[PDB]
């Protein structure tokens, strides 16, 4: 009759996306995602751990979570669920689940309870928890999306394989951006074993709900979190440089107390090269001709970091908040890195201007901004190319 | 393997509430309820409406929502949708449905669509929008909640049924707060047809999360938008009172030529009565008893108003934003409310503190506060006390 029903359509915001859930120690896990936040009530607690074995029992665990991202201006919130134990939940290893309890609120009383990752009987080793680990350095890449310049990522590849060596690996997260082409240009390092590419591209669902590149960083961080002694962060536009007197490794027995650090900057402009009628810049490496880079004298930049995700919980885009030890934002001269601004989205040649031979002594100004000469790349271009080839070969070798 | 699931559990807002769906003419309806209003995401639109006739036959109208509450605080937001038709959809009175679609942002991917209303075949009746209408006077009551005083409603009942004549009805919202007893002092005015008692306990499920009063007014004005030709929106601690020499007819006249006027408060304290022994409280009634109002001038406080409905397309609980024809605020001199603030919960004997026979005369204070002795409504209470005997019958007593 006058029975006012209230008839509710749709799901403007679920209350938690699982991405990833990941053992992060012998005590502690890990659920990567998305939280919708609340608004005018509590949410105490937003989470709760559980663990269920085989053997029908079950413990509960210290559930924290933290908001990584900026938290706000997006309908869901990167979260990052930690779920610590007072025992090893499993090495019983007669099988075990993880749950995760995630409240709307404190006063009204369902709520939703999932599986987060399941091991299987016998799937457990703790001789990977502790040296040593597959390899030393591990670069996660961005959340890729967009209309990527594949010819950018063989160069950034050879260059960085060569960069950190033989024992490290390489991290990609397809959003889109690995067009056939891209693939291509990763090809000779998939087969290798070098490079992973993942398929988030489902993604889609939430493109716009939440900040994109906070949660491809937190996942990559506990799903590799034992894969190395460091992990790196940073874009294929960016490549890491060191001033000369540094190995690599001779700037992390320095660093060695320092579980994350910054990395200061080189802006390269993406358009500014030489005039120059003998130079076939078609067929030159991008870091090999655009020699030209933004020096000023103390303006506060943007910022790359490694970490040693061993000694971590979350992380952002350019640091991380969220850490045990201490932060070394002073390496400037002794770790650098090149950033080449807007060029992975540029459809062809990058040498879009040409400026004078004088350029290279003089302070030329371009868009307002002046610039300098910088073939700090450029010299360590044919050491690279010879390094692909010893390597992957060719790439008319694809490989 | 490494391709990655976005798996999401859990419904932490629901895009769209239904509280109610109308026909507001022969080619325009709303749909009131709430909506969860997006987060950075374009939303445009947030709704479109359809007509989809028995035959299959489809037409859409335009589309526009309201937002009479505030628009942010809640996770629900107060939604008027309004369809209107380059024709009535439903002209041959074959019957058909209204429908809604509720989108989630821009990218209109996904999107909600559902029945709104119905109209049977040979249902649509053209002269339920052409006077005479069924009521002169129509009052929606706000939101029942909480313990309220029986003795009131009696009384507030009693004056009000006397105040707007028989050509008046009043619709009250039951949220719990209508308890036996109370439904009892409403039961003799339910059978005379003069009062109805929705029953809207449902919005619970969502109490906390949006404006309860704007729900509720906007469903009333929309629900008997041409039930009558005035809409009276006030609470039960408050008496529509006319400094006479002012019947009601000659009062709504002199205002015919605006759709909605506002009407100012005489505030009334409730816990203040006469130090008297020839006086027998418990049997007379609260405006009988509580004479005293607040006298401070030039202080601004919270007003209520009447509207026709007829050219009303939103409200909110002081007054319509959203009309055509204009608004008049100078009432002062001829309507007026008396509000006895706080009497509503209080169980028991309203007079709580006594004051002498100097205060008929003098000016009380209380509180801070200062107080003048009005017997304008106690006046009417033996006429009010009568007219409640003629026309529901003996009522027994005590308050
Ligand atoms: C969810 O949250 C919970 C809690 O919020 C997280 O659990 C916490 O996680 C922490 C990091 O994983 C962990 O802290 C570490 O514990 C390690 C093991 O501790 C055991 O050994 C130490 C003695 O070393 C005992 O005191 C302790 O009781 C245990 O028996 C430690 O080894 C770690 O210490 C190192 O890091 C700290 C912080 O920077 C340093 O101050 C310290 O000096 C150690 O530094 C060495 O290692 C770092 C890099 O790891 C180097 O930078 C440094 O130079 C040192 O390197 C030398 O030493 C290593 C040997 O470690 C040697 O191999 C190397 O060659 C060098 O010579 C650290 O303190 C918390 O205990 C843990 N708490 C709980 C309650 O679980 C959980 O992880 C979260 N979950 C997720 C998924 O994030
Ligand atoms: C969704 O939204 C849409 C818009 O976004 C809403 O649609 C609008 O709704 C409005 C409200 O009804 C409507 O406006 C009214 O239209 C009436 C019908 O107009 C038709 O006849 C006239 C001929 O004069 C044509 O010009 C017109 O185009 C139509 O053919 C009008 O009659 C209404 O006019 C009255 O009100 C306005 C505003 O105050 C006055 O300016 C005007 O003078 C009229 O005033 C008389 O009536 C009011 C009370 O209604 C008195 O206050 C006043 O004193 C006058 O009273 C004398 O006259 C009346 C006869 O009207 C008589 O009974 C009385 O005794 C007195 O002698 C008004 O203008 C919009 O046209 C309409 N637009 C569209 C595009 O749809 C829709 O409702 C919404 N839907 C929902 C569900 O919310
Ligand atoms: C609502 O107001 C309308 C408009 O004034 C009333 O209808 C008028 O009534 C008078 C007197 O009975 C007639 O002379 C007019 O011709 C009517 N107008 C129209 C357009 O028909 C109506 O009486 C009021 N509604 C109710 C229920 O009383
Ligand atoms: C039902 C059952 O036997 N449950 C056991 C529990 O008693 C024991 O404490 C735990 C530790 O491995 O393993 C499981
Ligand atoms: C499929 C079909 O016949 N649809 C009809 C439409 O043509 C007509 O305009 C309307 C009004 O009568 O009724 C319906
Ligand atoms: C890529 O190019 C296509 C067509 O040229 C365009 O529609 C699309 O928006 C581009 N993407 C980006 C990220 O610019
Ligand atoms: C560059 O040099 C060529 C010939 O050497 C000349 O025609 C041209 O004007 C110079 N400047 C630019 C911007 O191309
Ligand atoms: C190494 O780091 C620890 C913090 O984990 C700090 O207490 C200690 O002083 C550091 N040692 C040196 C030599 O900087
Ligand atoms: C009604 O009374 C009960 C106890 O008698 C109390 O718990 C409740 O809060 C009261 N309601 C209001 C609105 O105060
Ligand atoms: C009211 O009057 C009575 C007797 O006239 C007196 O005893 C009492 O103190 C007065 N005040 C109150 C608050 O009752
Ligand atoms: C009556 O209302 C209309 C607005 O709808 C206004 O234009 C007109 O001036 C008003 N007439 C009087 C006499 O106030
Ligand atoms: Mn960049
Ligand atoms: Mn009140």
Redesign the interface.
């Known amino acids: 009759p ?19 859930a990941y053992r992060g120690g012998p005590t502690t896990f890990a659920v990567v995602g998305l939280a ?1 936040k ?4 509590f949410r105490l607690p937003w989470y709760k751990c559980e663990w269920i074995s085989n053997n029908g029992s079950s413990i509960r665990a210290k559930a924290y979570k933290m908001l990584p991202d900026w938290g706000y ?3 869901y919130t990167v979260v990052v669920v930690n779920c610590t134990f007072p025992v090893n939940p499993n090495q019983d290893n007669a099988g075990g689940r993880l749950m995760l309890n ?1 409240y ?1 609120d404190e ?1 009204q009383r369902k709520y ?1 309870k ?1 599986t987060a990752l399941e091991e299987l009987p016998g799937s457990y080793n703790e001789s990977k928890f502790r040296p040593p680990y597959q390899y030393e350095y591990l670069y996660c890449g961005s959340s890729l999306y967009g209309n990527l310049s594949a010819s950018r990522f063989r160069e950034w590849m050879a260059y960085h394989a060569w960069f950190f060596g033989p024992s490290s690996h390489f991290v990609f997260h397809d959003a889109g951006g690995v067009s056939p082409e891209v693939r291509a240009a990763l090809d000779p390092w998939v087969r290798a074993g070098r490079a ?5 591209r ?2 889609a ?5 939440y900040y994109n590149q906070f949660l491809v960083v937190n ?1 990559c961080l506990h799903r590799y979190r034992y894969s190395a002694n460091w992990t790196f962060y940073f874009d294929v536009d960016e490549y890491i440089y060191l001033p000369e007197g540094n190995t690599l490794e001779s700037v992390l027995k320095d660093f060695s107390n320092y579980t994350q650090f910054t990395i200061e900057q080189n802006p390269m402009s993406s358009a500014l090269c030489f005039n120059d009628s003998t130079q076939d810049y078609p067929r030159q490496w991008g870091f090999e001709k655009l020699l030209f880079r933004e020096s000023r004298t103390g303006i506060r930049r943007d910022r790359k970091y490694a970490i040693q995700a061993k000694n971590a919980y979350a992380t952002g885009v350019h640091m991380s908040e969220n850490v045990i030890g201490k932060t070394l934002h002073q390496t400037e001269t002794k770790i650098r890195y090149y950033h080449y601004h807007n060029s992975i989205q540029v459809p062809g040649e990058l040498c879009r201007e040409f400026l004078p031979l004088s350029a290279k002594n003089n302070v030329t100004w371009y868009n307002g901004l002046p610039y300098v000469y910088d073939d700090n790349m450029k010299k360590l271009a044919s050491t690279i190319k010879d390094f692909e080839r010893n390597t992957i070969g060719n790439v008319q070798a694809y490989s």
Request: hydrophobic fraction near 40%; proline fraction near 2%; charge should be negative.
């Open positions: 006058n029975k006012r029903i209230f008839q509710a359509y749709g799901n403007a915001a679920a209350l938690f996306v699982q991405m990833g919708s609340p608004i005018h009530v201006g997006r309908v995630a709307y006063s939703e999932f992973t590419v993942q398929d988030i489902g993604q669902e939430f493109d716009g709900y996942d």
